[PDB]
Design a protein around this nucleic acid. Structure first.
Ligand SMILES: [Zn+2]
Ligand SMILES: [Zn+2]
Ligand SMILES: [Zn+2]
Ligand SMILES: [Zn+2]
Length: 112
DNA sequence: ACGCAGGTCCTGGAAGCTAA
DNA sequence: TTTAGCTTCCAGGACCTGCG
């Protein structure tokens, strides 16, 4: 009997996580950047965005040393040092390291 | 041309914490 | 002391972009 959203009927760990999810249906962004004025849905997104203004890149690759202000961009980059390409085109067989690029490569097949 | 990869921010579960 | 509900943190992903 986890807290269930009345709109989309999905459930969450506690009532505070549901209240945070309520904003995905309303579009409310209550965390505003003081520098540029852009607003964000979560405080952790605002803290990440502020590091862009200040040039703070604490996330660095242990293999090549490339630095990132965004922890997900660093996590996404470090995978490239493994060379894995787990996404294969169903039409031509071209393999991609990222699903975003196969999505784009399926468009060129759609327009043939 | 188009594969490649970084920029940016949204979403939610995990974990840590406060206060009822 | 307990623990519901709060804040923080982290992993993943969507969408965009410019480069070689
Ligand atoms: Zn909902
Ligand atoms: Zn800003
Ligand atoms: Zn690297
Ligand atoms: Zn293809």
């Amino acid at each position: 009997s986890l807290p269930e959203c009345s709109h989309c009927h999905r459930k969450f760990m506690d009532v505070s996580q549901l209240k945070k999810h309520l904003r995905t249906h309303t579009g409310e962004k209550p965390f505003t950047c003081e520098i540029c004025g852009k607003s964000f849905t979560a405080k952790s997104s605002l803290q990440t965005h502020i590091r862009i203004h200040r040039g703070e890149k604490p996330y660095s690759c242990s293999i090549c040393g490339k630095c990132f202000s965004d922890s997900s961009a660093k996590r996404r980059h470090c995978i490239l040092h493994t060379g894995k390409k787990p996404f294969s085109c169903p039409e031509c067989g071209l393999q991609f390291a990222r699903l975003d690029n196969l999505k784009a490569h399926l468009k060129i097949h759609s327009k043939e």
